[PDB]
Design a protein around this ligand. Structure first.
Ligand SMILES: *CC(=O)Nc1ccc(/N=N\c2ccc(NC(=O)C*)c(S(=O)(=O)O)c2)cc1S(=O)(=O)O
Length: 97
């Protein structure tokens, strides 16, 4: 598989179903690393259906936009405001599934 600490890109299509993602992190929200961790995933929502993204996975960028620094609300509203195919950048070292 990909190595731990591997930066990998996922293009998540919202083809199957609604996004059904939420995130946490930001300015030193609950999570210490402030990483934009996936907070919730709707069962068989786009992330879960795609199987690549799950809860606890950490996003850093969104279509080339460093989401780091931003608050958890922007992080959610960002996904919520993104389109069908979105380029998500994630780095390994995420929580278990
Ligand atoms: C998984 C999760 O946490 N989802 C969540 C959490 C809280 C709410 N309640 N109110 C709310 C609505 C909408 C927004 N932001 C945008 O619409 C861009 C916020 S936030 O900005 O404070 O996060 C809060 C809703 C939801 S939802 O089920 O994802 O709508």
């Amino acid at each position: 598989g990909p190595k731990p600490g591997d930066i990998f890109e996922v293009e998540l299509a919202k083809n199957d179903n609604s996004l059904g993602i939420c995130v946490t992190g930001g300015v030193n929200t609950s999570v210490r690393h402030g990483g934009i961790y996936v907070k919730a995933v709707i069962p068989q929502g786009a992330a879960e259906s795609d199987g690549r993204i799950h809860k606890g996975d950490r996003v850093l960028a969104v279509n080339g936009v460093s989401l780091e620094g931003a608050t958890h609300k922007q992080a959610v509203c960002t996904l919520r405001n993104t389109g069908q195919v979105v380029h998500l950048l994630l780095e390994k070292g995420q929580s278990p599934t």
